[PDB]
PDB file of C-alpha atoms in Angstrom:
ATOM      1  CA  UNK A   1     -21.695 -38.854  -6.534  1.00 34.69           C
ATOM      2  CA  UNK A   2     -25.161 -36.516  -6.570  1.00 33.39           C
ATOM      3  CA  UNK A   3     -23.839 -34.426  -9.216  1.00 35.29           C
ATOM      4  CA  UNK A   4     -23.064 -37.227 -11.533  1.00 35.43           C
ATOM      5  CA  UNK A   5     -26.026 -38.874 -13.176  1.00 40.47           C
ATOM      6  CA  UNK A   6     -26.223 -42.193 -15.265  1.00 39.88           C
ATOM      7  CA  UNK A   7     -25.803 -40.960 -18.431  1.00 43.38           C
ATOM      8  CA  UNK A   8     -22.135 -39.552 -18.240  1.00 42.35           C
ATOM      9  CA  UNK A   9     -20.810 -43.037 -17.121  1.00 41.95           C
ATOM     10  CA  UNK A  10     -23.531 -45.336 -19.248  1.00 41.45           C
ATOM     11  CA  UNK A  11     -22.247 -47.197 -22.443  1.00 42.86           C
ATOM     12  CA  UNK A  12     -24.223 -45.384 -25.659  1.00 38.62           C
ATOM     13  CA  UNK A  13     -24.962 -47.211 -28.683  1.00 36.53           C
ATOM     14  CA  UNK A  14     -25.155 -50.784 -27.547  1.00 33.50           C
ATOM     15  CA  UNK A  15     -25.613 -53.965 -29.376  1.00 35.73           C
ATOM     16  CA  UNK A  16     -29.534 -55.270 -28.877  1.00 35.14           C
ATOM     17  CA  UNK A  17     -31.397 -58.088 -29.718  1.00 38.47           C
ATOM     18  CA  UNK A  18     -35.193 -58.431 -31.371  1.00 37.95           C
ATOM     19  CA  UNK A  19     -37.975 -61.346 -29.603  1.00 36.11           C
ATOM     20  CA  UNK A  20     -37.178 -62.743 -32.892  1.00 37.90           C
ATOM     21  CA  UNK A  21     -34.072 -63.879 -33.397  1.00 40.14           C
ATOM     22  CA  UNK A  22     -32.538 -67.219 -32.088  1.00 40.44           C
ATOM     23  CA  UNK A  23     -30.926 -67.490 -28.587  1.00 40.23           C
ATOM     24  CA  UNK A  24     -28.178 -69.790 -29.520  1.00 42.64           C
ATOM     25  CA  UNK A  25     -26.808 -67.561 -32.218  1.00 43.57           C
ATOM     26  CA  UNK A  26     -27.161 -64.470 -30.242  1.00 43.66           C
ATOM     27  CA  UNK A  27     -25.072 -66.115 -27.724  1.00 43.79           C
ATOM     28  CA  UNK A  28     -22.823 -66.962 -30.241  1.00 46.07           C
ATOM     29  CA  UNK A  29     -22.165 -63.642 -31.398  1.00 45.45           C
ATOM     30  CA  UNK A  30     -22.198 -62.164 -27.492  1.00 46.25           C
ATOM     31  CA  UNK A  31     -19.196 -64.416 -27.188  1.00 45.22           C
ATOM     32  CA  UNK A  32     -17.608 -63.630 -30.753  1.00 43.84           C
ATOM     33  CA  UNK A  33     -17.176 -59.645 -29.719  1.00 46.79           C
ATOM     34  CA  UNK A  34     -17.164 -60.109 -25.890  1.00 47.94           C
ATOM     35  CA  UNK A  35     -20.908 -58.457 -25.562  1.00 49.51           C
ATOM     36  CA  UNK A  36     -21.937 -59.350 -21.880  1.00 51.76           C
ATOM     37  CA  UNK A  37     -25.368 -58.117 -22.134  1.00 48.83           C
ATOM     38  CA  UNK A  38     -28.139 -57.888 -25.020  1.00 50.15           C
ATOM     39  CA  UNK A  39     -31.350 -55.040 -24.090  1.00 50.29           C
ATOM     40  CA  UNK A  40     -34.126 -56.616 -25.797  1.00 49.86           C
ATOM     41  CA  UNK A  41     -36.134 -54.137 -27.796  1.00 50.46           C
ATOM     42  CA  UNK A  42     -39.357 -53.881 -29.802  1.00 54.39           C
ATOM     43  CA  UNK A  43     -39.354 -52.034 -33.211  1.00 51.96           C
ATOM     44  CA  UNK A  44     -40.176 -48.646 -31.398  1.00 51.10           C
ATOM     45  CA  UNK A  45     -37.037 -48.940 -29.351  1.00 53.42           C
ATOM     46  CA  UNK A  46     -39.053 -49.742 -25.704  1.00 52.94           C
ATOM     47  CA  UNK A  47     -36.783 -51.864 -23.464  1.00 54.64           C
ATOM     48  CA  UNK A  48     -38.837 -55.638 -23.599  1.00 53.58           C
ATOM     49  CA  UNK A  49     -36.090 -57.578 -21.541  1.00 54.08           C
ATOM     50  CA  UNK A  50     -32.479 -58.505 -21.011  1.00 51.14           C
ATOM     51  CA  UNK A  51     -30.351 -62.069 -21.671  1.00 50.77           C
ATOM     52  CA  UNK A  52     -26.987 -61.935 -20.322  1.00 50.09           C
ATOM     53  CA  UNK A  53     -24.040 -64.910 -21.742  1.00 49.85           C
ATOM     54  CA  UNK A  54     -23.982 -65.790 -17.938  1.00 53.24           C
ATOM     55  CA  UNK A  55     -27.759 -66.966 -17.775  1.00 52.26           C
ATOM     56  CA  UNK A  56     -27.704 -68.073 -21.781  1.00 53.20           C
ATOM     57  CA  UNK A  57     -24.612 -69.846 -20.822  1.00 52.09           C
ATOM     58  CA  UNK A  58     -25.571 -71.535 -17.931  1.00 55.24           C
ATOM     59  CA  UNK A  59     -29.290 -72.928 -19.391  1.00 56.84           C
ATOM     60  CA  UNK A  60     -27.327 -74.210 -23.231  1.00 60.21           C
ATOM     61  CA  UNK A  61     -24.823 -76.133 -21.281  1.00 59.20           C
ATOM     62  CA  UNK A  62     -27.650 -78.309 -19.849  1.00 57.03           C
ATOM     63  CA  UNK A  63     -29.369 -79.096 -23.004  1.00 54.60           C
ATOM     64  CA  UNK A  64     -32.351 -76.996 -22.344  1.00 53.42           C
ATOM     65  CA  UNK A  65     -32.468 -74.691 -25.602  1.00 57.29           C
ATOM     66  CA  UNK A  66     -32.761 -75.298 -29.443  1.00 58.39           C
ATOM     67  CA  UNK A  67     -31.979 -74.033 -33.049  1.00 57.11           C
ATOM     68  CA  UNK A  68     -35.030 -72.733 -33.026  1.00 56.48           C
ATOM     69  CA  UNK A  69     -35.243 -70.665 -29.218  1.00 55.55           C
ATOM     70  CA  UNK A  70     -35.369 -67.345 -29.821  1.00 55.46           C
ATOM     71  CA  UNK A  71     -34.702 -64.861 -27.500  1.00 59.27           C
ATOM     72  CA  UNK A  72     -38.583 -64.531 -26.833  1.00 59.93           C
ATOM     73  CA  UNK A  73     -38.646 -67.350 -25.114  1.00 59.41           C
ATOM     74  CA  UNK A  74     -36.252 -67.475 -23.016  1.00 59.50           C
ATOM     75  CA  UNK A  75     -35.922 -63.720 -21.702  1.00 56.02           C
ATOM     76  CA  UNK A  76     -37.300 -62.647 -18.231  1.00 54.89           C
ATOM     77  CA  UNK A  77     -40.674 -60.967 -18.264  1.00 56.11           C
ATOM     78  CA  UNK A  78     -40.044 -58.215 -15.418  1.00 53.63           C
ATOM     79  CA  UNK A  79     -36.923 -56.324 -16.628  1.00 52.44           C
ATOM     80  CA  UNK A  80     -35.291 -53.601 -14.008  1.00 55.34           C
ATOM     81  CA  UNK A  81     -34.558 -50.411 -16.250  1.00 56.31           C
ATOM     82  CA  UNK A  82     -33.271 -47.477 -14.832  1.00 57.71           C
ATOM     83  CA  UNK A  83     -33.989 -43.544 -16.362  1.00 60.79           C
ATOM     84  CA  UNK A  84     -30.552 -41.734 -17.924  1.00 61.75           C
ATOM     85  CA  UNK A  85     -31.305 -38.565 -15.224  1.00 59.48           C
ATOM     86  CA  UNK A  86     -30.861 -40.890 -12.257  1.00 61.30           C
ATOM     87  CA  UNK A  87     -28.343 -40.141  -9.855  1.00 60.23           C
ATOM     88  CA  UNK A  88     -25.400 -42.812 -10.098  1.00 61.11           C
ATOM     89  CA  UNK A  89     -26.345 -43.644  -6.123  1.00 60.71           C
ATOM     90  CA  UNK A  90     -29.693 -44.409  -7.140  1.00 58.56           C
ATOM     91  CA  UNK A  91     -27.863 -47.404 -10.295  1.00 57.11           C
ATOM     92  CA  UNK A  92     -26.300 -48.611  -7.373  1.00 57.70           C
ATOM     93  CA  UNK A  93     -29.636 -49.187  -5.061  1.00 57.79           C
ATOM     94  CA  UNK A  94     -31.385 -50.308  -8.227  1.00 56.70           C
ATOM     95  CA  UNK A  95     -28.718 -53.093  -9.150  1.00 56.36           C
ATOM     96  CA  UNK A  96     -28.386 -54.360  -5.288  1.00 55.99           C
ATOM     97  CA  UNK A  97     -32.188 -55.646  -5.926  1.00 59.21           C
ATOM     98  CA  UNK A  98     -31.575 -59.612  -6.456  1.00 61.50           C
ATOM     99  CA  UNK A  99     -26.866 -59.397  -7.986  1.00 60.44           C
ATOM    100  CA  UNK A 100     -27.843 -57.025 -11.172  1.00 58.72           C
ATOM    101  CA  UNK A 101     -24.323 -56.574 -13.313  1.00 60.55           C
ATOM    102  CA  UNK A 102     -26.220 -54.502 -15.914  1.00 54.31           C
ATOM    103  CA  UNK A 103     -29.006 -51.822 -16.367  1.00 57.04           C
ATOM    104  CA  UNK A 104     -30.885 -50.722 -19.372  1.00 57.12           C
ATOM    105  CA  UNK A 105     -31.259 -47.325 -19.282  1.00 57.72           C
ATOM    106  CA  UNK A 106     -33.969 -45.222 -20.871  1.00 55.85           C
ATOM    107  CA  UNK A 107     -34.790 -41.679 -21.477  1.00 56.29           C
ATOM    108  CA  UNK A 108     -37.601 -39.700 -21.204  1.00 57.02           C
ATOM    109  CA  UNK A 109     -39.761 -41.776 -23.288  1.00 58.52           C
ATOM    110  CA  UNK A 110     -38.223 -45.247 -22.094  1.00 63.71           C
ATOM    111  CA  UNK A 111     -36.724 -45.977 -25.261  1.00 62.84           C
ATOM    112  CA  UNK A 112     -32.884 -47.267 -24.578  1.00 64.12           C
ATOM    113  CA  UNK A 113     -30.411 -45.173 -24.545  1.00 64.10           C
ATOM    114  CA  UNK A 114     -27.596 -47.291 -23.398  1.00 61.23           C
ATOM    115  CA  UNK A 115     -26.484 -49.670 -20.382  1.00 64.46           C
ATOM    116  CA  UNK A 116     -25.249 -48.962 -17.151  1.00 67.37           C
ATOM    117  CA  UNK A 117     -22.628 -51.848 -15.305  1.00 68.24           C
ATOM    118  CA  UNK A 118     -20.901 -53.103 -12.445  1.00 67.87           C
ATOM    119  CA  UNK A 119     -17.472 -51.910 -14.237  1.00 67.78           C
ATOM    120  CA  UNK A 120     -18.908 -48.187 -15.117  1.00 66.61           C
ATOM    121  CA  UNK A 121     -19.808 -47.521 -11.384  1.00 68.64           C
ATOM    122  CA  UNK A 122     -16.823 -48.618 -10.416  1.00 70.97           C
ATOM    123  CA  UNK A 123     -14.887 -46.941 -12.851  1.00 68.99           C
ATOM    124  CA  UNK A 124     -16.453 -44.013 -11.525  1.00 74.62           C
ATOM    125  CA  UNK A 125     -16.290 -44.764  -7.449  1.00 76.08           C
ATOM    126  CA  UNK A 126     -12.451 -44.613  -8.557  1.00 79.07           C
ATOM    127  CA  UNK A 127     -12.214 -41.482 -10.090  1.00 73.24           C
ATOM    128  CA  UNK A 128     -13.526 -40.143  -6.868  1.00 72.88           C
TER     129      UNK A 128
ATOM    130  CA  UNK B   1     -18.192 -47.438   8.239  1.00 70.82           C
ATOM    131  CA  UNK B   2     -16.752 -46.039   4.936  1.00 72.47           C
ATOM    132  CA  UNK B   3     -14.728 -47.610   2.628  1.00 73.36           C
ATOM    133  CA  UNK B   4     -11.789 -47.424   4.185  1.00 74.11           C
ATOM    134  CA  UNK B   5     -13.163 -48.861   7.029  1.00 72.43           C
ATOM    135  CA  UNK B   6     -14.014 -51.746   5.580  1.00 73.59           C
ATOM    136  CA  UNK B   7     -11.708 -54.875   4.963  1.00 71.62           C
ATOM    137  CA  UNK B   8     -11.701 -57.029   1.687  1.00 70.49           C
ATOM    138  CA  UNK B   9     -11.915 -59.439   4.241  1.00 73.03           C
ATOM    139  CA  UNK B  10     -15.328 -58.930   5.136  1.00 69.84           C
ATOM    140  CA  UNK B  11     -16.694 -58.881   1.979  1.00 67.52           C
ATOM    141  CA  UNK B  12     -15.011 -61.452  -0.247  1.00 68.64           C
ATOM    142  CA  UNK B  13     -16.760 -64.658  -1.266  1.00 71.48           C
ATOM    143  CA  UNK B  14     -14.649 -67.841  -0.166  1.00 72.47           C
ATOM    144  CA  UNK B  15     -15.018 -71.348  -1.290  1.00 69.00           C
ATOM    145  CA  UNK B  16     -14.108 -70.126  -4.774  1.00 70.40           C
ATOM    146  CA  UNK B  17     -13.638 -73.210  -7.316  1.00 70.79           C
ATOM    147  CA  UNK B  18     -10.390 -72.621  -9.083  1.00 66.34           C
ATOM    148  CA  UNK B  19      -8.734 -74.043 -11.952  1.00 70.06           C
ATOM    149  CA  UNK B  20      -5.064 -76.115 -12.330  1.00 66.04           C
ATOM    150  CA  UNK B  21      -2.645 -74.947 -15.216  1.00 68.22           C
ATOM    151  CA  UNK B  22      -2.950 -78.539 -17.015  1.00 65.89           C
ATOM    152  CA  UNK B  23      -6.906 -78.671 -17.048  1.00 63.79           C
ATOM    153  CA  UNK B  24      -7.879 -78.424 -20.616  1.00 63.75           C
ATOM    154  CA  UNK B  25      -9.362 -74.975 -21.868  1.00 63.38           C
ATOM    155  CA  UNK B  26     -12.361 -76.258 -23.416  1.00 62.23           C
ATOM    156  CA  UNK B  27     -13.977 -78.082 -20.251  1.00 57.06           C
ATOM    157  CA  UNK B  28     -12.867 -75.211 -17.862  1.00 59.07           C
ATOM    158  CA  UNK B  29     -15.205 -73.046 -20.081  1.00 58.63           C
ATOM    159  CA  UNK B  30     -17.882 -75.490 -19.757  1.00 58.34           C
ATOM    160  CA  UNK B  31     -17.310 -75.807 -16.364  1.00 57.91           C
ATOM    161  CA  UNK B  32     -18.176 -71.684 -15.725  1.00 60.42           C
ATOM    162  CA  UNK B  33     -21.254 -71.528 -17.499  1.00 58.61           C
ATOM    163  CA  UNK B  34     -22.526 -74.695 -15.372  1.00 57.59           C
ATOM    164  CA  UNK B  35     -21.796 -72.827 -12.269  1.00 59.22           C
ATOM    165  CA  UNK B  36     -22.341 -69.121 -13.685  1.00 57.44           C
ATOM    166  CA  UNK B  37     -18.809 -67.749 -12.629  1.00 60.37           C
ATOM    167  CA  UNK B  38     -16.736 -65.093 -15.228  1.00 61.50           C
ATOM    168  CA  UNK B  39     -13.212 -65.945 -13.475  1.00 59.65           C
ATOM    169  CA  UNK B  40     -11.114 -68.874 -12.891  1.00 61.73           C
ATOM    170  CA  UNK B  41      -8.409 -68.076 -10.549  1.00 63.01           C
ATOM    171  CA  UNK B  42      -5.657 -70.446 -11.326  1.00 62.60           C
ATOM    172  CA  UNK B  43      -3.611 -72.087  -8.551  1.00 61.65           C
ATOM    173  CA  UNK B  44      -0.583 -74.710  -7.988  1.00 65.75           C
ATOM    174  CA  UNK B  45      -0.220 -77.663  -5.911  1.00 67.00           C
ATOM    175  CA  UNK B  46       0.218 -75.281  -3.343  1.00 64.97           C
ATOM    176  CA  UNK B  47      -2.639 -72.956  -3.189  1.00 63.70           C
ATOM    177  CA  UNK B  48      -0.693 -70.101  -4.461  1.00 66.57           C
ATOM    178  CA  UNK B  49      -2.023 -67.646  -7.060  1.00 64.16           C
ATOM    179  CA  UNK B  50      -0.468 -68.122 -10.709  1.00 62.15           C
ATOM    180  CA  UNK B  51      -3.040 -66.631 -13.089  1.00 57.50           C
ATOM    181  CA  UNK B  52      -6.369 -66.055 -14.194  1.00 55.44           C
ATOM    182  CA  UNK B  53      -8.722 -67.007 -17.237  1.00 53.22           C
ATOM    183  CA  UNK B  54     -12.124 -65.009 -17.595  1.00 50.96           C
ATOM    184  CA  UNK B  55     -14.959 -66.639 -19.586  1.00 51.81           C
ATOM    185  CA  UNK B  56     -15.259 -63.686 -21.809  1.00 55.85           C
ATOM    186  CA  UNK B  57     -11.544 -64.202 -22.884  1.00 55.97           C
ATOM    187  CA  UNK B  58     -11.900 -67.888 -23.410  1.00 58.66           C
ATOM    188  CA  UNK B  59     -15.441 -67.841 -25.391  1.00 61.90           C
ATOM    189  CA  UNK B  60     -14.130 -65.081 -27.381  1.00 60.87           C
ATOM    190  CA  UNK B  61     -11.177 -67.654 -28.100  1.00 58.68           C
ATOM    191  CA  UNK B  62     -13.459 -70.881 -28.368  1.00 59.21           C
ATOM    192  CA  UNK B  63     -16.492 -69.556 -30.791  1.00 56.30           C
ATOM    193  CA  UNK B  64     -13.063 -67.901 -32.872  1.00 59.86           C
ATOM    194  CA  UNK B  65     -11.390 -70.690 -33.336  1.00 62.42           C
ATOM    195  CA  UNK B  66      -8.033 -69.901 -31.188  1.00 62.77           C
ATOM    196  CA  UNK B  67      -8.088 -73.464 -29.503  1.00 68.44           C
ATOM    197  CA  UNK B  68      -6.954 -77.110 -30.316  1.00 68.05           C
ATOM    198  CA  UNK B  69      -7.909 -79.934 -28.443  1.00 67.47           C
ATOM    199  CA  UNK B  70      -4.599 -79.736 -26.438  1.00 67.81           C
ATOM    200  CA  UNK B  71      -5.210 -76.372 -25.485  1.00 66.74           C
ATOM    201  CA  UNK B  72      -4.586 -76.005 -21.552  1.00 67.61           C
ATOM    202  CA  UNK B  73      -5.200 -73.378 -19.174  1.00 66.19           C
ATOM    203  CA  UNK B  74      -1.562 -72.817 -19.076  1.00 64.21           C
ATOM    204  CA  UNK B  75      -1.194 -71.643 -22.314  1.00 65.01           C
ATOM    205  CA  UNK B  76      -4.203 -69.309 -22.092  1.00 67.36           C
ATOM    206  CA  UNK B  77      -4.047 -67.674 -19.080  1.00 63.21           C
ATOM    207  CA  UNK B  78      -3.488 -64.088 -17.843  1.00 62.47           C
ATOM    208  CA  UNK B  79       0.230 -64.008 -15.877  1.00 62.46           C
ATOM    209  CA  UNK B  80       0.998 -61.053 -13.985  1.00 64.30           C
ATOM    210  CA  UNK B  81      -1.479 -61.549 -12.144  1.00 63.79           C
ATOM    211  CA  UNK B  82      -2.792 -58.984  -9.799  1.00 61.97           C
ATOM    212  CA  UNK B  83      -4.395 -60.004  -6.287  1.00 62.40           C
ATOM    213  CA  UNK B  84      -5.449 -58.093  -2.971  1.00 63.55           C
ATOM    214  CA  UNK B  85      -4.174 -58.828   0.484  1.00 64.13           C
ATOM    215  CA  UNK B  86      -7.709 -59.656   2.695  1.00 64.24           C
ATOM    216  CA  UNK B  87      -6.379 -56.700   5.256  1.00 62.45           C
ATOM    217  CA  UNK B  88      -6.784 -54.075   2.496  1.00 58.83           C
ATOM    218  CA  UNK B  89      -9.589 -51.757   2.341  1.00 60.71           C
ATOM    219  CA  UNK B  90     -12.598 -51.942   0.066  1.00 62.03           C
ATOM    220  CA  UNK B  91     -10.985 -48.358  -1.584  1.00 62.71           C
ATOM    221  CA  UNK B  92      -8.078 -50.160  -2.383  1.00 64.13           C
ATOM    222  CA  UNK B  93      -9.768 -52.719  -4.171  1.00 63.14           C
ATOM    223  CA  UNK B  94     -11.571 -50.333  -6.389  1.00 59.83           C
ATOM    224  CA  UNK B  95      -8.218 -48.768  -7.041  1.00 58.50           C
ATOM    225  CA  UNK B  96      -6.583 -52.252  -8.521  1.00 57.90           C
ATOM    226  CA  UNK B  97      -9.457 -52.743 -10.483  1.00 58.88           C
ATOM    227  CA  UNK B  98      -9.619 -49.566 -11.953  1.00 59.32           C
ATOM    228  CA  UNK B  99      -5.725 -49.208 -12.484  1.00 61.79           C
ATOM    229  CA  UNK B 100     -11.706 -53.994 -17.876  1.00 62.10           C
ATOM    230  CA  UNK B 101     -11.019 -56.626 -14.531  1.00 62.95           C
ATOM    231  CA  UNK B 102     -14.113 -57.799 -12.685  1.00 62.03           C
ATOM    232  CA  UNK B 103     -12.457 -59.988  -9.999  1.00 62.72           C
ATOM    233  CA  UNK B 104     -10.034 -59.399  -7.330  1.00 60.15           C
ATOM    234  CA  UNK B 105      -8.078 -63.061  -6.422  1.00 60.55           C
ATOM    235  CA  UNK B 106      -7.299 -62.422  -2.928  1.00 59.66           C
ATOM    236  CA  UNK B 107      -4.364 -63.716  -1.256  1.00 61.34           C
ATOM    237  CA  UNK B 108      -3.338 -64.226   2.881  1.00 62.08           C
ATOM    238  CA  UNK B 109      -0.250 -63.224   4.783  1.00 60.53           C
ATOM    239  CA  UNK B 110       1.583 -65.645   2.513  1.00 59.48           C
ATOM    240  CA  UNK B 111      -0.016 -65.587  -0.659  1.00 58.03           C
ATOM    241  CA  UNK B 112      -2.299 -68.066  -0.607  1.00 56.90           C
ATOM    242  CA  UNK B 113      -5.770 -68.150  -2.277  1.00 54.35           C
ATOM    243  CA  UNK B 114      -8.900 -67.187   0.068  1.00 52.02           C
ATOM    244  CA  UNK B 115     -11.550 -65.493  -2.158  1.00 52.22           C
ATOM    245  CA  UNK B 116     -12.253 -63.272  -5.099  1.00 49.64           C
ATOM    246  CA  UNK B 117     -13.542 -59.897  -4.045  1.00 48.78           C
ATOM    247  CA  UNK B 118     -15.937 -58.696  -7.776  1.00 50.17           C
ATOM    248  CA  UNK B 119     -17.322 -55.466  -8.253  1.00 52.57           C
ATOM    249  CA  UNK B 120     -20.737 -56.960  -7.608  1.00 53.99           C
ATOM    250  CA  UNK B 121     -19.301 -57.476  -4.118  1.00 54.64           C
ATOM    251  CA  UNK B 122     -18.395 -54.190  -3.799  1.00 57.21           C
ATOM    252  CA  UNK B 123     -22.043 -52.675  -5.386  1.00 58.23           C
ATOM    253  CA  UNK B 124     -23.346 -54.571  -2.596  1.00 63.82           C
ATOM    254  CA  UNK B 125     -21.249 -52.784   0.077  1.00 64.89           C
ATOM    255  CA  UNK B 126     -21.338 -49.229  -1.438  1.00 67.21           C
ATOM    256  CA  UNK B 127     -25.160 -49.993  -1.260  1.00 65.12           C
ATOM    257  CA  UNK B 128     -25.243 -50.136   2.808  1.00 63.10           C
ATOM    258  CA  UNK B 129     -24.476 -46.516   2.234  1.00 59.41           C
TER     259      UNK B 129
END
């Protein structure tokens, strides 16, 4: 597993969401194409958060978000990224930190370059 | 320890809330975002294993449309389903799930329900290594 590295098992151009735009309809449209995670990004591409349609999910069904929420709101402040040379060992330390389904990951210059999961590092365990 | 030393025993969650084949499709959904869980294992009378719904699959079904008011579990769910016996290895548990599955329903000498192994479970026990 040292000679693979996160980004030949990472998924590439994901689906992201802007501070912006409203929670309710993102989650909406997570569930319409089966999106399980949504990178949060400012309009230089830096990572700014994560919201998931597990944690969405599990805050809408008790009321506590509006129309108006957007994604600002209601996305955590301290977002665990991990860098595309990582070794796929290291995703796997990283995500046990509570687990973590999902990573951003970011190049060089911490702009996203895709997301690692659960599923991929699994995926990959198995091809082993 | 390695992960063929390991049984799916040891590192299954139990207590798993599960779903009955007449329950309406609409509250079961509701029902997993309240308590944050992706898979419904669905059981009979008798404990036994006789499919699965995922919350992915039924949202994507929901927010689309798919669904009356009538709509049951039983006409949603997943059939063949595929399960792990709790004496099997961690390895072969990543094999079943790689051969888009999550979850693991895992079954005992006789095929009755006693957890759902995930691949968060199994992050968690690569990590020890």
């Amino acid at each position: 597993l040292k000679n693979i590295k996160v980004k030949d098992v990472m998924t590439k151009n994901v689906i992201t969401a802007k501070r912006h735009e409203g929670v309710v309809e993102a989650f909406e449209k997570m569930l319409k194409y089966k999106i399980s995670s949504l990178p949060v990004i400012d309009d230089e591409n830096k990572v700014i958060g994560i919201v998931t349609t597990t944690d969405i999910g599990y805050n809408l069904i008790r009321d506590k978000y509006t129309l108006e929420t957007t994604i600002g709101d209601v996305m955590t402040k301290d977002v665990i990224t991990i860098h595309e040379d990582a070794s796929i060992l290291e995703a796997i330390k990283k995500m046990d930190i509570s687990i973590i389904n999902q990573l951003p990951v970011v190049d060089k210059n911490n702009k996203l370059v895709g997301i690692i999961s659960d599923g991929d590092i699994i995926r990959t365990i198995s091809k082993i």
